[model samples]
Target: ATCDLASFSSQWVTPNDSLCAAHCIARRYRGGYCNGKRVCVCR
Candidate 1:
């Protein structure tokens, strides 16, 4: 699997995002951004 380290709290429903920043646990970026689609794209 991708091993993105995502959880329920990581899922947000709006832009103004900062939740994923300290929670994504991605690769190079090690961060994330919510696209307001009730999902966060991390990596």
Candidate 2:
């Protein structure tokens, strides 16, 4: 299934009360638990 913004499931939220924000320091972007349910962060 395509997990695009439109199809994103907002049911998942991060600790900050928003969608998971990928750690910018990583070599590549990655989404948290919330990603699996909704629009995951772009790699």
Candidate 3:
């Protein structure tokens, strides 16, 4: 699945002013983007 973080919050109809819960967790623990897309890691 490919998600654009900037558009996701709106497209997903997410709650306003709340943390992007799943994304926040992923970023903190995995060092990944909040997009939920599989981005290639730079070497």
Candidate 4:
């Protein structure tokens, strides 16, 4: 997964990267991962 965090929200609070990745997967994305911080990147 590889996406820009800014596309979603402006905050990187709770729910860690893995959680965010799950969100992306649930949304039918190929896959996802933590960019560097708390942002989830989906491909």
Best by lDDT: 4
Say what the RMSD of model 2 is. 5.9
Return the TM-score for each candidate structure.
0.29, 0.21, 0.21, 0.35
Scored by lDDT, model 2 comes in at 0.40
- Order of all candidates by lDDT, from best down to worst? 4, 1, 2, 3
Query: Pairs clashing in candidate 1?
Result: none
In the range 1-26, model 1's lDDT, one tens digit per residue, is: 12233453533343223666556654
Q: How many angstroms is residue 11 displaced in model 3 relative to the true structure, after the best TM-score fit?
A: 18
Q: What is the C-alpha RMSD of each candidate to the true structure, in Å?
A: 9.8, 5.9, 7.9, 7.6
Residue 26 Cα positional deviation in candidate 3, in Å, after optimal superposition: 0.7
lDDT per residue for candidate 2 within 1-43, as digits (tens), equals 3333454455544322134444522535543433444534444
Give the per-residue lDDT digits (tens) of candidate 4, residues 1-43: 2334445553554334457667787888744565655545664
Lowest lDDT block of 10, candidate 4:
1-10
The local lDDT score (0 to 100) that residue 28 gets in candidate 1 is: 50
Q: Estimate every model's Cα lDDT from 0 to 1.
A: 0.46, 0.40, 0.37, 0.55
Could you tell me which residue pairs clash in candidate 2? none
Worst 10 residues of 1 by lDDT: 1-10
